[PDB]
């Protein structure tokens, strides 16, 4: 029957909720209460990247950290040299409604997608020397929300069709499909090993996925609204999430329940983007109020504010070296903060 | 190596020259979002003017307009609709005759009420607050047939219609009955009540009694986009 399965699911939900409560011996705040607070953090705008004609939706830093790809709704994908502000490549897009972009670890290829429902792969190192779309991945039935390359031949994506899907670029076919989420998947973040990935959807739930298996190992709840952003802590054992409820929460994998909650009575706007500093001590969050808040991840204190955008901050990225933070806004500008 | 630095500088200038041309073509084009239910008549309106998102390119007196229809997207629009916050205007198509309980139209007891809810959610969205709406009250030909026949009464699903009186600006069509005029004007007044409540001058609503085969639909959109651009230039000068 449907009721017996429903009460059985409720039984399992309460059993999980008791098992997780049995591990809540001490809060992360109590454990970190005795360490020195970070104090005021002051970051200046070193580089302002100009050239996009419409709102920026996404940006990804290259592994070298000297370069970054930005994605805008004017139909253009732009590659920038952050050390000189020089544009390395401007890629015209077939569909103007791009919502995501990704840089490969090698840096040989980049990826973009959006309302077209397609993840398009562009080669940046052609024999002719001209950037050309090299593969179009068409399986997804809803918009592309996020993408990340595991390597040059593999890339994971998330769609508004409620699902995620590993792709083999050479074949163009989905090796495996992740369909656990019930709402539009908004974001995903690969673990440093790349064995696992986390995903945030519009169901106020985050899912941990085994890439090779294609199975959801853990589900994490407690957000009041849609999860817009997600990022793994740099050790791979925890991750942070940003929601429309104007709150950020840090969720531990081994503990299977959120260690910390970052909120403030004055913040009543949703979060668009979250990133961690190289140590993981600082959590950076982009907001709909046009400002990024720097949080002390261990103590949940607002260390600093980045305030240079005139429109909603759409995306944030910290360099691989940890030297810089990039911010992209609906104001058409990307700002690099030190 | 100065050779790498001068090459990157030249590459940047070649890109900037191409981006200047792109800016002229992007800023000269007017972007439209067409929203409608399956039985609104948006598809027929699109067919007359004439992919996870469908695009139609049409021109009106030297002016290029790019129109976007959803296509393959789920029925949840809270995330995807935020992408259309820069369009010139949102052409919302509503079937006027869908006030009664019809199994064929989405199996919905009231499609007009669902259209009213959608319009109120779009008009009051924080991201769409500055975006003007061109309301297309489509299927007026069917509405006249249903109101003249009289089997299904609007007052059953819209009790206020019993006290409704057609206003002095009725401008009825040649040979139109008073009953059709009171009906369509009540339909238009339902949407105007939502738009008048929160517009605040940031965005404007342009209602139009439309039919799926009307040749005037393209000229109405041209005129609405011209009035929208005029008000946006007036606002910059503070003339309002």
């Amino acid at each position, epitope marked *: 029957e449907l009721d017996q399965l429903r009460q059985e699911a409720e039984q399992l939900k309460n059993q999980i909720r008791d098992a997780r409560k049995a591990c809540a011996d001490a809060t992360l705040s109590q454990i970190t209460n005795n360490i020195d607070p970070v104090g005021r953090i002051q970051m200046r705008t070193r580089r302002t990247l100009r050239g996009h004609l419409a709102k920026i939706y996404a940006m990804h830093w290259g592994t070298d950290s000297r370069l970054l790809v930005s994605a805008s709704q004017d139909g253009k994908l732009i590659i920038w040299d952050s050390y000189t502000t020089n544009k390395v490549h401007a890629i015209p897009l077939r569909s103007s409604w791009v919502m995501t972009c990704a840089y490969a670890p090698s840096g040989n290829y980049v990826a973009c997608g959006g309302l077209d429902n397609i993840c398009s792969i562009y080669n940046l190192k052609t024999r002719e020397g001209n950037v050309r779309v090299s593969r179009e991945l068409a399986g997804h039935t809803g918009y592309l929300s996020c993408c990340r390359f595991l390597d040059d031949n593999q890339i994971v994506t998330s769609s508004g069709d409620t699902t995620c899907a590993l792709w083999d670029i050479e074949t163009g076919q989905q090796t495996t499909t992740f369909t656990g989420h019930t709402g539009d998947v908004m974001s995903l973040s690969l673990a440093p090993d790349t064995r696992l990935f986390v995903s945030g959807a519009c169901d106020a*739930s985050a899912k941990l996925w085994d890439v090779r298996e294609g199975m959801c190992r853990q589900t994490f709840t407690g957000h009041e609204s849609d999860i817009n952003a997600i990022c793994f802590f740099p050790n791979g054992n925890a991750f942070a999430t940003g929601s429309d409820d104007a709150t950020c929460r840090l969720f531990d994998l081994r503990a299977d329940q959120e260690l910390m909650t970052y909120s403030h009575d004055n913040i009543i706007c949703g979060i668009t983007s979250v990133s961690f500093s190289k140590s993981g001590r600082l959590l950076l969050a982009g907001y709909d109020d046009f400002n990024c808040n720097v949080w002390d991840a261990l103590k949940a204190d607002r260390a600093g504010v980045l305030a240079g955008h005139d429109n909603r901050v759409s995306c944030l990225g910290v360099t691989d070296d940890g030297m810089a933070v990039a911010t992209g806004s609906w104001d058409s500008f990307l700002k690099i903060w030190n | 190596q100065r050779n790498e630095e001068k090459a990157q500088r030249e590459a940047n200038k070649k890109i900037e020259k191409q981006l200047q041309k792109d800016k002229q073509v992007y800023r000269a084009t007017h972007r439209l979002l067409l929203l409608g239910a399956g039985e609104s008549g948006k598809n027929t309106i699109v067919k007359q003017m004439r992919s996870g998102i469908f695009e139609t390119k049409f021109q009106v007196d030297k002016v290029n307009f790019h129109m976007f229809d959803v296509g393959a997207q789920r029925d949840e629009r*809270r995330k995807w609709i935020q992408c259309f916050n820069d369009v010139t205007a949102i052409i919302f198509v509503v079937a006027s005759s869908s006030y009664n309980m019809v199994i064929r139209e989405d199996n919905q007891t*009231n499609r007009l*009420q669902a259209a009213l809810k959608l319009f109120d959610s779009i008009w009051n969205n924080k991201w769409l607050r500055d975006t003007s709406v061109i309301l297309f009250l489509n299927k007026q030909d069917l509405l006249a047939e249903k109101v003249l026949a009289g089997k299904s009464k609007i007052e059953d699903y819209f009790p206020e219609f019993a006290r409704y009186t057609t206003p002095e600006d009725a401008t009825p069509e040649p040979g139109e009955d008073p009953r059709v005029t009171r009906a369509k004007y009540f339909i238009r007044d339902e949407f105007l009540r939502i738009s008048t409540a929160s517009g605040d001058g940031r965005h404007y609503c342009y209602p139009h009694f439309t039919c799926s085969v009307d040749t005037e639909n393209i000229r109405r959109v041209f005129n609405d986009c011209r009035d929208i651009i005029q008000r946006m230039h007036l606002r910059q000068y503070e003339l309002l």
Partner: nanobody
Amino acid sequence: QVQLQESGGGLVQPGGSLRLSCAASGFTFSNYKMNWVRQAPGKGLEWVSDISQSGASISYTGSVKGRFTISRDNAKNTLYLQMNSLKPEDTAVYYCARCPAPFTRDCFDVTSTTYAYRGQGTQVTV
């Protein structure tokens, strides 16, 4: 975890009266506009009523106006629908539905199939 559980639905005679209750947990109830939606058999989900966060702004569908009352208690985290003068057309599964985001004037997707922030529903028969 966001949870909405409806109750109070059952079989009534034509002209009878029911009172549906929705208990809410896992979110700040006061920050969200609440809605009652219904799915009649063989038909799609239809919006019935909405209440603002304070309870000051209230709307109803035309078919149920003057027969249905929507109320919310912020302290109890409870949403209520009082249905009077019930008719056979009012036979449906009733689902209390929260608006997606808090503090927002707009409310989108509450009547959409597979909406996350919606309870399992309570069937009402006349």
